[PDB]
Amino acid sequence: RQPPEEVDVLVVGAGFSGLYALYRLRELGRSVHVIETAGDVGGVWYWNRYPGARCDIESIEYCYSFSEEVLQEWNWTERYASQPEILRYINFVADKFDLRSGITFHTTVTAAAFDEATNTWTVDTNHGDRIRARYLIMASGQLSVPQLPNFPGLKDFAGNLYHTGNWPHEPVDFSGQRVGVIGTGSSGIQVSPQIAKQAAELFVFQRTPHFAVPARNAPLDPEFLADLKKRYAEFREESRNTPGGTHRYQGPKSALEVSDEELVETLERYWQEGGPDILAAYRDILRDRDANERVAEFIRNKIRNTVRDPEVAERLVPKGYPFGTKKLILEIDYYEMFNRDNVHLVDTLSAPIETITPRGVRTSEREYELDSLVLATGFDALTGALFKIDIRGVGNVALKEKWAAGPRTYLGLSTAGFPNLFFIAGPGSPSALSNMLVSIEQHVEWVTDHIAYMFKNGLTRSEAVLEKEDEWVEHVNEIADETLYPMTASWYTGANVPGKPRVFMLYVGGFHRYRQICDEVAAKGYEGFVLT
Numbered sequence: 001r002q003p004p005e006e007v008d009v010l011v012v013g014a015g016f017s018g019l020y021a022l023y024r025l026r027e028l029g030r031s032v033h034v035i036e037t038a039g040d041v042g043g044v045w046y047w048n049r050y051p052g053a054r055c056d057i058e059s060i061e062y063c064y065s066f067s068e069e070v071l072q073e074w075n076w077t078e079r080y081a082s083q084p085e086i087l088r089y090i091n092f093v094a095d096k097f098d099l100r101s102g103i104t105f106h107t108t109v110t111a112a113a114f115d116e117a118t119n120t121w122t123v124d125t126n127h128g129d130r131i132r133a134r135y136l137i138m139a140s141g142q143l144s145v146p147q148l149p150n151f152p153g154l155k156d157f158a159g160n161l162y163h164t165g166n167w168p169h170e171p172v173d174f175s176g177q178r179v180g181v182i183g184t185g186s187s188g189i190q191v192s193p194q195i196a197k198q199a200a201e202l203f204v205f206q207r208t209p210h211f212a213v214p215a216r217n218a219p220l221d222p223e224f225l226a227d228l229k230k231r232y233a234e235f236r237e238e239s240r241n242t243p244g245g246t247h248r249y250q251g252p253k254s255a256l257e258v259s260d261e262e263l264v265e266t267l268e269r270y271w272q273e274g275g276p277d278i279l280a281a282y283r284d285i286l287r288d289r290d291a292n293e294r295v296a297e298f299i300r301n302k303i304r305n306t307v308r309d310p311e312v313a314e315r316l317v318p319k320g321y322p323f324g325t326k327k328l329i330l331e332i333d334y335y336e337m338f339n340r341d342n343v344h345l346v347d348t349l350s351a352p353i354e355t356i357t358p359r360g361v362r363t364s365e366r367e368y369e370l371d372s373l374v375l376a377t378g379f380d381a382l383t384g385a386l387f388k389i390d391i392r393g394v395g396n397v398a399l400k401e402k403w404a405a406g407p408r409t410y411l412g413l414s415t416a417g418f419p420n421l422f423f424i425a426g427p428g429s430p431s432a433l434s435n436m437l438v439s440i441e442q443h444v445e446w447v448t449d450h451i452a453y454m455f456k457n458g459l460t461r462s463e464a465v466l467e468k469e470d471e472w473v474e475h476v477n478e479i480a481d482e483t484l485y486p487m488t489a490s491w492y493t494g495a496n497v498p499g500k501p502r503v504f505m506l507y508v509g510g511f512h513r514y515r516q517i518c519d520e521v522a523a524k525g526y527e528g529f530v531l532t
């Protein structure tokens, strides 16, 4: 499917963000096309096919609300949609509104330059395509460029090498093999208990132990669902007016103010129920390092109470960083896994990896023989995908350069000096600190209403104001700084990628507030933008 030479709005990416952009611009009467590297729709859920892949936000929440038809017809099956089912949903949504005729697949965008002469962007691909668009929507994701560490012997490994984020399309057989996994972020924790069932040995290469809590996944009762459907927009609307974009109860109490007996009884109740909801058990879990510690420790005794070898258990216990400052992971049978004879924890904090060999992984302590090695080493996050593209603004300024000391944006949506360009659900915004559907819907709607507003008013150049951008970056940092978020090396902060600026990259005031700010801005004629 050839891309058009000329288009009102060009969209990069056909995951959730891109598809909505496409749908909406068409609804608004604008011409619009999508360029996507993948072979089909899906984005993260197309790429991440490792066995176990599964959302951490509940199925009833992690979905589109923009269409009534879709809420009424689609039927989710479990509390947490596995990867194949979310893919199925996205294909369902693709068909329904005939989105594929808007999309060139197998094509990567490689450069994009703004031409002040004509207020347009000109966009280039590895297929040689060149597109002229008035507006450029980058919907190219938050976690979309796989981060494989440059472990010294990587290219010499004689076995099979994987990355969870670029997973093969046919199912991989690990039966009888010695398998290692590096990384115990949630990919690692999700993929490992699956490989453990097939492998003769599983070696789990852990560095910083992350906090995970049980998911308590269950079947979803068709009755619950049917009741839900009657009141569905009302439900999403409730979700939309929360810090997190989902139905978390926001605990009024401070975790220091309660007694021991009430704390344990509270948290036990969260632990039986499962889910990320513990995160907001007490209003100060992310604000005060002592409040934090009272919750963390409770989790830590859980780990020590689930793992039968008390030495391995201690190795598994999260240390060194505040609870919740790394993405809090939902585990299904990850800890019980280590009770199996064929599962082994390699603590690379205490024995670091020296090199990959052709037979396996060498630490300072021993060499581990492996047929396969799986990299759950995460993603060059938030900026990665933009950075792989040579984006050029007014004065021929590289985006890569303007952003070399960290992302600089006004509301995350735009960056001054690069008019007519927008970033869906990324730095300087709520992004992954919330149910991403909610964050993605608001950004698609806000941006595309914006474009329609430029067209209804016969305008052609929309650009953020330098002072307002600076005032936004300062604000993001200032408020991040009253949380424990900047205290740890997480991908939120860039520190997972050696050399990458460590700045906490996201808006932490919560979805709801960020939307209001965005509505106040839009209502005033898009204050902090200069439209001509």
Ligand SMILES: Cc1cc2nc3c(=O)[nH]c(=O)nc-3n(C[C@H](O)[C@H](O)[C@H](O)COP(=O)(O)OP(=O)(O)OC[C@H]3O[C@@H](n4cnc5c(N)ncnc54)[C@H](O)[C@@H]3O)c2cc1C
Residues within 6 Å of the ligand: 012, 013, 014, 015, 016, 017, 018, 035, 036, 037, 038, 042, 043, 044, 045, 048, 053, 054, 055, 056, 057, 062, 107, 108, 109, 110, 139, 140, 141, 142, 143, 144, 187, 385, 389, 424, 425, 432, 434, 435, 436, 437, 440
């Ligand atoms: C394994 C995993 C699970 C997730 N689970 C959750 C969850 O629990 N809760 C939640 O809220 N969200 C979750 N996320 C976050 C996730 O990023 C969002 O939920 C959402 O799927 C991102 O959608 P998107 O359209 O914004 O970006 P993506 O789905 O990443 O789509 C971006 C697309 O753009 C394409 N692209 C990038 N560069 C180019 C290029 N130059 N040329 C052409 N195409 C390009 C990519 O191929 C990709 O398909 C998860 C992320 C991962 C990695």
Ligand SMILES: NC(=O)c1ccc[n+]([C@@H]2O[C@H](COP(=O)([O-])OP(=O)(O)OC[C@H]3O[C@@H](n4cnc5c(N)ncnc54)[C@H](OP(=O)(O)O)[C@@H]3O)[C@@H](O)[C@H]2O)c1
Residues within 6 Å of the ligand: 054, 055, 056, 057, 143, 149, 150, 182, 183, 184, 185, 186, 187, 188, 190, 206, 207, 208, 209, 327, 330, 348, 376, 377, 378, 379, 432, 491, 496
């Ligand atoms: N169920 C879900 O919702 C889900 C699933 C997957 C991903 N995601 C999203 O995408 C993010 C990515 O998570 P992820 O599982 O892909 O990975 P991640 O959270 O980035 O963690 C990567 C893991 O690899 C380790 N690591 C990185 N570089 C290393 C090196 N050079 N040597 C040894 N270990 C190294 C890290 O150890 P250290 O932490 O100590 O550096 C960490 O264990 C998640 O936090 C979440 O936002 C969500």
